[PDB]
Amino acid sequence: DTSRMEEVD
Amino acid sequence: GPHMQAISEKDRGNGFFKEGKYERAIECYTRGIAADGANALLPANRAMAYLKIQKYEEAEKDCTQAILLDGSYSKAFARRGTARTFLGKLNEAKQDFETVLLLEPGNKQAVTELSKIKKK
């Protein structure tokens, strides 16, 4: 799997 | 200590970002980026809030900051390419989405957002 853009910590 | 102080203003701004109070998240992360200025995750969350308030010109800059400190953060490149796409810097965003594909091979955004470029 790979990283999604829309997020914070 | 200095690390825990830079966590506190991150943990604080995240809670405003979850509540949709994106500007208050920007304010908190700014206190951390100004206290420390060496963590890539602080400006990486600040850029997301600038992008939600449609200040893509300002979101681009904080995404570049996360790439100056870390240089390997696929989320920061995906956020810069996305900001540039709505900024009109579509050719500069093409290069950032191609860079996400170096950091994660077959990345779902790095195919799809690079494919949105060609909707001419």
From Swiss-Prot, chain A:
Essential for interaction with SGTA and TTC1: region residues: 6-9
Compartmental location: Nucleus; Cytoplasm; Melanosome; Cell membrane
Paired cysteines (S-S): none
Region annotation Essential for interaction with SMYD3, TSC1 and STIP1/HOP: where it falls in the sequence: 5-9
Superkingdom of the source species: Eukaryota
Record note on modification: ISGylated. S-nitrosylated; negatively regulates the ATPase activity and the activation of eNOS by HSP90AA1.
Motif TPR repeat-binding, residue numbers: 1-9
Subunit structure and binding partners: Homodimer. Identified in NR3C1/GCR steroid receptor-chaperone complexes formed at least by NR3C1, HSP90AA1 and a variety of proteins containing TPR repeats such as FKBP4, FKBP5, PPID, PPP5C or STIP1. Forms a complex containing HSP90AA1, TSC1 and TSC2; TSC1 is required to recruit TCS2 to the complex. The closed form interacts (via the middle domain and TPR repeat-binding motif) with co-chaperone TSC1 (via C-terminus). Interacts with TOM34. Interacts with TERT; the interaction, together with PTGES3, is required for correct assembly and stabilization of the TERT holoenzyme complex.
Reported function: Molecular chaperone that promotes the maturation, structural maintenance and proper regulation of specific target proteins involved for instance in cell cycle control and signal transduction. Undergoes a functional cycle that is linked to its ATPase activity which is essential for its chaperone activity. This cycle probably induces conformational changes in the client proteins, thereby causing their activation. Interacts dynamically with various co-chaperones that modulate its substrate recognition, ATPase cycle and chaperone function.
Domain comment, as recorded: The TPR repeat-binding motif mediates interaction with TPR repeat-containing proteins like the co-chaperone STUB1.
Assigned protein family: Belongs to the heat shock protein 90 family.
Protein name: Heat shock protein HSP 90-alpha
Organism name: Homo sapiens
Swiss-Prot record, chain B:
Coiled coil: none
Entry superkingdom: Eukaryota
Per-repeat ranges for TPR: 6-39, 41-73, 74-107
Function: Forms an interface between the RNA polymerase II enzyme and chaperone/scaffolding protein, suggesting that it is required to connect RNA polymerase II to regulators of protein complex formation.
Subunit structure, interactors included: Tightly associated with the RNA polymerase II complex. Component of the R2TP complex composed at least of RUVBL1, RUVBL2, RPAP3 and PIHD1. Component of the PAQosome complex which is responsible for the biogenesis of several protein complexes and which consists of R2TP complex members RUVBL1, RUVBL2, RPAP3 and PIH1D1, URI complex members PFDN2, PFDN6, PDRG1, UXT and URI1 as well as ASDURF, POLR2E and DNAAF10/WDR92. Interacts with PIH1D1. Interacts with TSC1 and TSC2. Interacts with PRPF8 and EFTUD2 in a ZNHIT2-dependent manner.
Protein family (similarity comment): Belongs to the RPAP3 family.
Protein name (Swiss-Prot/TrEMBL): RNA polymerase II-associated protein 3
Gene this protein is translated from: RPAP3
Included range, full protein: 281 to 395 of 665
